[PDB]
Amino acid sequence: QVNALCEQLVKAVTVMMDPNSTQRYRLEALKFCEEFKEKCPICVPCGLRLAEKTQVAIVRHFGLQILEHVVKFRWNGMSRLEKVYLKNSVMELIANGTLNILEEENHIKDALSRIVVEMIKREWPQHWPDMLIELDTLSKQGETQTELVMFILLRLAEDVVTFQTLPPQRRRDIQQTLTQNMERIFSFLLNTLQENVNKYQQVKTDTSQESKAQANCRVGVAALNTLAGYIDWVSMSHITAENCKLLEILCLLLNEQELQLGAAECLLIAVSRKGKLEDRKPLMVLFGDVAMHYILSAAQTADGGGLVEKHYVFLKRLCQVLCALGNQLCALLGADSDVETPSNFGKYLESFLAFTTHPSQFLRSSTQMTWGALFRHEILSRDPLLLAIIPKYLRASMTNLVKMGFPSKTDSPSCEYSRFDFDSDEDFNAFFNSSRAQQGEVMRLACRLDPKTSFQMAGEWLKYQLSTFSLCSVFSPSFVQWEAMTLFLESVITQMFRTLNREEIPVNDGIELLQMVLNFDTKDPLILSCVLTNVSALFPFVTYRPEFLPQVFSKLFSSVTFETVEESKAPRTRAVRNVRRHACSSIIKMCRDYPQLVLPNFDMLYNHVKQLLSNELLLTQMEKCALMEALVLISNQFKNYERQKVFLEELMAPVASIWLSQDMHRVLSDVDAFIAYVGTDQKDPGLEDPCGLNRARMSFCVYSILGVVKRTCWPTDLEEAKAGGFVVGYTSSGNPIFRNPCTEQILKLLDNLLALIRTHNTLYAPEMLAKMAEPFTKALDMLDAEKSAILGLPQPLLELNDSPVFKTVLERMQRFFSTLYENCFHILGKAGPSMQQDFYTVEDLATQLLSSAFVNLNNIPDYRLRPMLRVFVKPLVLFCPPEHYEALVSPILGPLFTYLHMRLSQKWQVINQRESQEMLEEQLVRMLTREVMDLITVCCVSELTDLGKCLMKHEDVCTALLITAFNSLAWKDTLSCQRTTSQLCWPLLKQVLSGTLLADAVTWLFTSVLKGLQMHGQHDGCMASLVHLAFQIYEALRPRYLEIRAVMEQIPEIQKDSLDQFDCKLLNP
Amino acid sequence: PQVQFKLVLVGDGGTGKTTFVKRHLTGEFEKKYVATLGVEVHPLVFHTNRGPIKFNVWDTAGQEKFGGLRDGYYIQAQCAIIMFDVTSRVTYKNVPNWHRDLVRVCENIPIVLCGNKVDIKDRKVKAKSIVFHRKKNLQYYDISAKSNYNFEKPFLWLARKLIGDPNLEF
């Protein structure tokens, strides 16, 4: 009987929808329900009984779900009359079986529409041709049935087009039929939206009949929400049909609170569709008079006053609409198709700028991408409208550079919006950093399109900063606006001197500003750093007025020895250290970019640095050797080999004396003398002075040599090059050959440098690392800041004014060892291009490098091996001329590539077997692998290079190279296998195809490519490229070697009968 | 216990949502996978600066054969959590399905998307491949029932959205 079963079902569903129900009871009721749905013969009458309006919404939903279930699973077990009865039943449930729009729950409408959708998917076109006419004659009855039809069409389109929850046969049938009736469907949706928006607006403001309005409105929303389910994939013919009536009504609805979000969603999905540019051309109708009128009206409501969640979500949606629209215009105009600058292109800008001046950081940051795409367009950057909107954009960008809007603070009106967009101040901090790095480039483009007004704004911001406003400053509004003004000024000036001519630059204003920054004085480290960046930015103006050269020096050198009001009482702070380092950097940049202007003052500067280094304890080693770098940078202006050589030898005489002493030799060559001289010997454990001065002197020598190899150079102009005695000769190709003045001085220190590198590599041995005391036994480790730097995890800024000094002495030691390593290999990397011939023709230099540079690679860590390859090996080989490839590059690269290959193999073996102490090392393996593969790729292929061929013509380097390349496909790295198969493997094999090939290394090779297929597999890219590679290997190596066919036989689920046919056609001519 | 909120926990089968709620309730990790039959409702009380807040979490079966009244479980839901697996890309493939069925019944409710099992080494779903939460204006969190990584962040975000206080904290 039906009624007893219906009461039972009511009890079951009532129990299941009760959260306080017991689990045993839940499983009993659920089991009874599933069994009922599976094998009951009166499911349809029961479900129709439960879905009647007299029942609770839970029960009605359950019955409608029963109907959906019998359509979904038991439709093929039903007769024709049963199917007709169910169809007419649910159709009349649409007709008169539901409540009103405003009184019915959405889960009942969804539950009812699901049934009709499921029947449509069962048999729409062949067995139900009058379905759309039935939805039409149903919709004409009222707005309830209309909303139901909207539900049905939306869920149908989603199910067949987006999710494809159908057999592909029925899926293609229904999609084709939709494509055929798309004009009628979009006609129904557009007409419904039009007429219902009319019915709503006619009663939008009326107290007599609100339920009527809320009826039509709720349908107008529904239509929109269903339109968004079709616009993304429907042909553009219907989106623009009836003179783009859909897009114009869509833009008008942006000003209706109840409909603005849906219309903005449909506009977003309509303006984001991709494909043929000719198919995206009609989207320019959104720049029409009515469309840009309504869009501009909606954007102008972004006053930024207060945060209303509804309004703000709408503003983000519309912002995305304007962004994607701008990207569309930049895409269509660039193709030079018959598309012209829109007549209302100004209005769009005026709308877009509304989101640029908004307090919300997310809106402006979202705007930045389309701003960048706009400022580099070849047609739009020359448009007077953009050039007229650019000053206001520059002002807004100035308001963007200032770090305001923390979720915790309440300084700027942006803060509240941040509280709505970010969980904490940290997420807002990272977002702000990324958006600032993005803002720099677009801001630069704006400065390119208008340098004069940009210079006015930058300078005026500088003056305002000069005249305005833990006794020092720590990330206060003063420091934040100082940093913003500093960034803006630096970019504006650096770009202005790039776009304007030497006749167009307003010298007087610039030198006025420079004077103002020089006279400005502060005892606060951070503000002084901003000042030094400002004078460093304003320095190009001194070319026109060199008389300011001394004052500039007085501002910089003073800051080199800057200290707080207390000097020896408190430890040195990171802030003041950054002021001294920043000053030294400004001196280096100064002497490097304008050495002809500083050359007259070389006497005073040399003596000043001399007095500054008279006290070995006054300046740090980075500061000393930075000033020395500046000195040699000025000495490059002598343009005379002999004079520069004499100055360099005189300047290096103390460093050469300390470095070439018997004691320094004994300490650099021996391990025990080194570990005792450095401080790792004993645990007063808190005092690092016993050997800290020693480490400072060694670091002084290394830093000095590095700076000399890095900053010394011959004149650029050829006439000035050979006129000073630098040209030794010319290559057979005509390219000149030069000699470096520092060569004879660095070469005499080269041997002790190599000895130090040898000892440093030897230190990582486990029996050599055991020497250090337990507080120092982790001194050769990776710094926690480097760990969190590579691991991606950022840490909040330790305020540089207090708790600044690295209190861990172990951290001091780790900084020392890391700096020494990277600096030594930096010298070995720079030595090539600085002293090309004389550095590459040293006797037994390759044997020496193997003896020192690569002596204990087995124990050298990854975070030390990677900077050796990037910093030393890559410049050594990429700058070496071909005349020494046999002499230098090959003998080093052979064992290097062999070891690198093997090490990556074992380490990836450790990877495949599978808290942060081990998560970091894996990332180290990945990045080191990228660096190695990039080294081989840049070193061999351009296909091959004379170095690639030359290395290939050698036996060891060829083998190690090919083994590395092919077994690299087995790593769990897809981006690398795509580049490796296409650019690396096939040029190798093609280069070694003609000749002898090993009888089974072919099996190892093909099986390695098969390993690449097994590892990646699903990634379409390495699947296609790997399949192509293996196909070339099989078609090129099977007729010569039979061993591969067995490797094909071991493949799972391969048929031998078709394999024999493939080989049969393979043998045929 | 001042107010209750209905939270529906959906996702593909095996994404780790029963293990998630079980870890919240009891602090126990269940290595074995036993699929949910229908739904399992559990209470989760949080103590905030605004007082105690209760979450009735309806832990939904992810598999079709073991789903009960699937969308019927979403009735009168005030917040949702769609969970996928960062080890199985198909889960992230099916996230839009769960989202559509959720939004069709529960219009304009806070929904959190969670990528579970971040603790595993081989991560098939790269973090940059996750754009759907931005596509539907949902909040995303990387979570791990075993590591407890970002344990309360979905519940905290949902609570802040429902109560309407950005400064709400546990």
Ligand SMILES: Nc1nc2c(ncn2[C@@H]2O[C@H](COP(=O)(O)OP(=O)(O)OP(=O)(O)O)[C@@H](O)[C@H]2O)c(=O)[nH]1
């Ligand atoms: N490594 C790791 N494994 C997890 C994590 N979370 C869940 N798992 C495992 O994934 C399996 C999933 O189990 P369930 O949580 O019951 O599956 P479900 O996602 O709830 O889907 P249902 O079948 O509908 O219950 C469990 O057996 C867990 O061992 C996680 O955070 N890390």
Ligand SMILES: [Mg+2]
């Ligand atoms: Mg479950």
